[PDB]
Amino acid sequence: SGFRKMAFPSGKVEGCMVQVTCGTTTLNGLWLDDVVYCPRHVICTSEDMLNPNYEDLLIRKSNHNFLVQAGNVQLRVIGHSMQNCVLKLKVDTANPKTPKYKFVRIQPGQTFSVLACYNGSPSGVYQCAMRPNFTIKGSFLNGSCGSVGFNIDYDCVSFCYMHHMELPTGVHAGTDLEGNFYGPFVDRQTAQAAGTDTTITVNVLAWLYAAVINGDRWFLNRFTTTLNDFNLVAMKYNYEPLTQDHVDILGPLSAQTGIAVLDMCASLKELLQNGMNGRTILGSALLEDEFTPFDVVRQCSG
């Protein structure tokens, strides 16, 4: 037992991280098969990033302008194209360490592991969630761009995130592996508004279920509620509206604990309305929304 924020093992992804330089700028790339993926603002100078013309900048660029390094082994670029906001550099050598992989575009609420990298060398690994406003609250310094987020199913790495930038508010934004930004964001250094950041209600219910599973029971109460009454309270407290699908997905944990989803909701309503009164739940004095129901099952089942 016990319950921690846990990242996927990062080995399969470590062996695809490469260093990518263009002129003076260096950032991280992901080498899969004979293609390196990386953020397209690698072709910018610091002057360029306020209002870059990516077509015009890329036209001044030849294959031999892209330096791609893999430890000390270094790749010859033979093709280069821009797909939305990513560079796809065709290289002569297929990655011997390519896992079985897939590109996927996750949904707000869903979680993934980030392998934070600098100069193509892995530095650390942590789990984070795609917030409802399509930002992520991560840990990224300059040069981390091109780091990726990913889940692992058995043997298959599903790449969902590539890091592009830090908004002036100090949160983070990036694309899927086809170059489409999550959220309304653009890759120029400007003032960009994220939306209101609501709380991912279903995750919070999953986290309460993990709490009961690991001994923390003090918040189980004697009330029930309806889904609509709970949704009223939820929107009062800027929570995501809870739908029938969310109740379905919480089904398994409801069954293993013997606690009906709607009674967990009554518990959570009482916590939103009264606080926690200085108590703690799984060693936190806040309500945690970064565990999906699948994350709780995978941790509580092995």
Add this chain to the structure above:
Amino acid sequence: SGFRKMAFPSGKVEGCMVQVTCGTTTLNGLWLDDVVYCPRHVICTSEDMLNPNYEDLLIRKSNHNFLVQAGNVQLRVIGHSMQNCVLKLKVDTANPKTPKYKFVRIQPGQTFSVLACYNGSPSGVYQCAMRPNFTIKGSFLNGSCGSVGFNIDYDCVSFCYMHHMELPTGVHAGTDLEGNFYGPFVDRQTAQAAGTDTTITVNVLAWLYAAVINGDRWFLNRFTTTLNDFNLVAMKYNYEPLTQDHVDILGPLSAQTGIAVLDMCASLKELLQNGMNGRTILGSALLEDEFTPFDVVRQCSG
């Protein structure tokens, strides 16, 4: 910027995790060079674990009683010895993937990454601290035994932890890689008292420094204090006594932020005496003690 609980990349360790079976019991082993290390209670049945005679159980054991698996590749055991509470099984094959490694015995307060494994297959990775009472608050189900904790310096894996058991209180205990339990603990399933669990004061100061580094300033006050006055408050609140060495080690962060250690202590005294009044620090409503000053520098410097 941003600040997260971040684990080392786990690849170098993944390639040493193996499966180890003896009779009916299976757990995880660490294969380095031509030696597999694993917990010695692998030689027990469920009956045996209340009062095991490890010498007498091991004498009924031959090399061919230990099944060591590496994915599907399987190792022939040629030697076996018991060192304190670990089995060292000499195998014919050296691990092609052996990193440069070292065995180290960390100190309370220090942190490491755990690669939680089942049946020799890695499941997840997370960062945790050796508590002052030599337990760790981890995430371990039955079968995780033999999982290891480790730090990485450049290219060198320093193994410090191997997981043996869960105390009935739901916290976790284990050994260094020579088989010496951290803490007063024994590998029999009995009621074992851990000490009082104090808070690792120096880590809390490091975490406040990371907080200021990332924009959270609301807790900087206008008071100062002495080291002895602060130690009085600290022991009132069951904190680790803060020593000159701790002030030294906090030096670098004091310099980068321009905030004198003793003024950070005055801040922390005021937080211990008044709470946080519903505010948050780096997205937590508790005082976090699981970042060492080195962890803060490594995250805030890349």
